[PDB]
């Protein structure tokens, strides 16, 4: 249906539909403070939202309107929440140097992570739920193995602070985007800098990956959207 879902610094969750005019439905007062994350499941009947209200709320795609099943009462300033594409694992970043990975079905607190010294700015996990990447403002990437809750390798890169990281759905090869205006391409097995991009020169705020093709979309502070087609 080409439906679009967005989040604000106001505690609200407004959607945009392309065949119609702009607004069909708006959630208002979903949270009190700013929300910071929004993840989509494989189906789409439930979304997960993470906010500065120390709350994580699920949102039920009723047919088309939204309601909540449960809320999650936490203690920290939630930044990114991501669900597994295998629909099993739900990772949550906090204000602390902690990543909590929850089971999807009953929220059993499967896992916790330590040792990062600065809060996690984006969480990824693989297509098959094997590797976790939790990039944070502490100038490094810590690649966590998802089987036993350990890391395989930490990785200092991207001088300023690392905003967004996303994966390739084919294999363990990922990108990295950061405030120091560099985009880098990595191995999930060799752990080496493959290809290093410098093109758009301000702070890289956003990143997205084509789900089959492999073109790379990045955003700047200075208003540039760069598309990197794979040869």
């Amino acid at each position: 249906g080409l439906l679009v879902i967005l989040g604000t610094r106001n505690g609200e969750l407004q959607l945009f539909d392309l065949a119609s005019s702009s607004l069909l439905d708006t959630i208002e007062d979903a949270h009190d403070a700013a929300i910071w994350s929004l993840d989509l499941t494989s189906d789409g009947k439930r979304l997960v939202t993470g906010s500065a209200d120390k709350t994580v709320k699920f949102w039920d795609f009723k047919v088309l309107k939204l309601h909540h099943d449960t809320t999650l009462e936490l203690t920290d300033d939630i930044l990114c929440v991501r669900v597994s594409p295998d629909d099993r694992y739900l990772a949550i970043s906090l204000l602390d140097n902690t990543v909590k990975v929850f089971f999807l079905d009953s929220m059993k607190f499967y896992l916790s992570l330590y040792g990062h010294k600065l809060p996690v700015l984006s969480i990824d996990i693989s297509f098959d739920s094997k590797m976790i990447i939790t990039s944070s403002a502490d100038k490094n990437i810590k690649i966590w193995g998802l089987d036993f809750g350990d890391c395989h390798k930490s990785l200092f890169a991207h001088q300023d602070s690392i905003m967004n990281v996303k994966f390739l759905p084919q294999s363990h090869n990922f990108f990295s985007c950061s405030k120091d205006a560099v985009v880098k391409y990595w191995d999930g097995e060799k752990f080496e800098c493959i290809q290093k991009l410098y093109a758009h020169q301000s702070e890289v705020w956003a990143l997205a990956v084509a789900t089959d093709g492999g073109f790379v979309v990045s955003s700047s502070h200075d208003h540039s959207i760069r598309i990197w087609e794979e040869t």
């Binding site: 059993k108 499967y110 193995g145 089987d147 036993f148 809750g149 350990d150």
Partner: protein, 360 residues
């Protein structure tokens, strides 16, 4: 080649009981109904272990691999290093040698290298607290089991060091006709290459179950790090109830799974502890074949042991039918007089057993 056993069942038990008796055995038709019939790799690897500790033993394998001939030699021992194959953990190999430990010509200083835990076989803490205290009740005083490096599946790389220095002439004649009263619940919760917050969260599963019990609950958090923490990550807990009066210990264990909840596993083993205790009398179900043997190979005298019918399964009878085919010792079973429970006293005239090998 005179006593013949059928099937690969209790294979490491049958090599032990032939070795102490000195009666030659021939175990034929091992896994004959398989697409890969015959022995496995580790069963061959275990036969290399008996050769290394006993000089004079003759071991013959037929070229179909299903028939194993073993004329036992005397227990020499000494110090050596056995490599454990990655199929079975090192606890599959520590457990038979404790039957051979107090009788060797020299000290057992045997170094084991490999994976140190699994689902089936005994962990290191299962032996250091569950089996070695059974040993001391029969008079094996200076017995130990040290941990150098701890491993975990699938790569392992862990090392234990079996050191047994008490070399006694026979196990003493045990009389335990009283169900021991549990004084404290001890335990070890270990973890390798993973987050140290698991171990306290493991214990929180265990202390959640036991809060209705009034005895001491203490679990030593054993967090491993560094090079002596083995290759592959993993964790596990081992819980031990004990009796202050005579030193009897009851235990249960399990390890972590590929994706397991550490709150559940700390809750699970404490349930498996109390389930084991509820079926128990003076031993555990996994400590009972170590003690059944030590009444048999104890000296020419009646021992007594208060055991429970819940322990008596199909597995327990196959233990008593391996002894009668070797040592020809009927195990008399009498009811107890306590009408609240179905305990029975297992009375065994021990076969008159010595040390062939120890020097004077």
């Amino acid at each position: 080649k005179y006593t013949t056993f059928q099937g690969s069942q209790n294979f490491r038990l049958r090599i032990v009981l032939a070795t102490l008796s000195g009666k030659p055995i021939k175990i034929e038709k091992i896994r004959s109904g398989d697409l890969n019939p015959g022995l496995k790799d580790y069963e061959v690897s275990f036969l290399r272990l008996i050769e290394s500790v006993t000089n004079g033993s003759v071991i013959e394998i037929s070229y179909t691999g299903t028939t194993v001939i073993y004329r036992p030699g005397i227990i020499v021992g000494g110090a050596s290093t056995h490599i454990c194959p990655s199929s079975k953990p090192v606890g599959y190999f520590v457990e038979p040698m404790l039957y051979l430990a107090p009788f060797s010509k020299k000290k057992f200083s045997i170094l084991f290298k490999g994976i140190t835990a699994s689902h089936n076989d005994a962990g290191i803490e299962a032996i250091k607290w569950g089996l070695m205290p059974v040993m001391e009740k029969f008079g094996v005083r200076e017995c130990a089991l040290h941990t150098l490096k701890r491993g975990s599946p699938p790569l392992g790389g862990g090392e234990v060091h079996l050191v047994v220095d008490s070399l006694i002439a026979q196990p003493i004649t045990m009389h335990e006709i009283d169900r021991p009263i549990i004084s404290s619940i001890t335990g070890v919760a270990y973890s390798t290459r993973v987050s140290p917050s698991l171990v306290n969260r493991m214990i929180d599963g265990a202390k959640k179950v036991l809060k209705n019990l009034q005895c001491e609950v203490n679990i030593t958090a054993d967090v491993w790090r560094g090079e002596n923490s083995g290759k592959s990550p993993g964790w596990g807990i081992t819980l031990v109830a004990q009796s202050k009066q005579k030193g009897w210990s009851y235990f249960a264990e399990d390890i972590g799974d590929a994706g397991s909840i550490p709150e559940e596993l700390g809750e699970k083993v404490a349930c498996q502890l109390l389930e084991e205790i509820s079926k128990s009398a003076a031993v555990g179900r996994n400590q009972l074949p170590l003690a059944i043997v030590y009444m048999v190979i104890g000296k020419e005298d009646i021992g007594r042991l208060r055991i429970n019918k819940e322990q008596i399964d199909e597995r327990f009878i196959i233990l008593l039918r391996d002894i009668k085919k070797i040592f020809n010792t009927e195990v008399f079973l009498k009811p107890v007089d306590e009408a609240d429970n179905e305990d029975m006293i297992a009375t065994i005239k021990g076969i008159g057993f010595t040390n062939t090998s120890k020097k004077i």
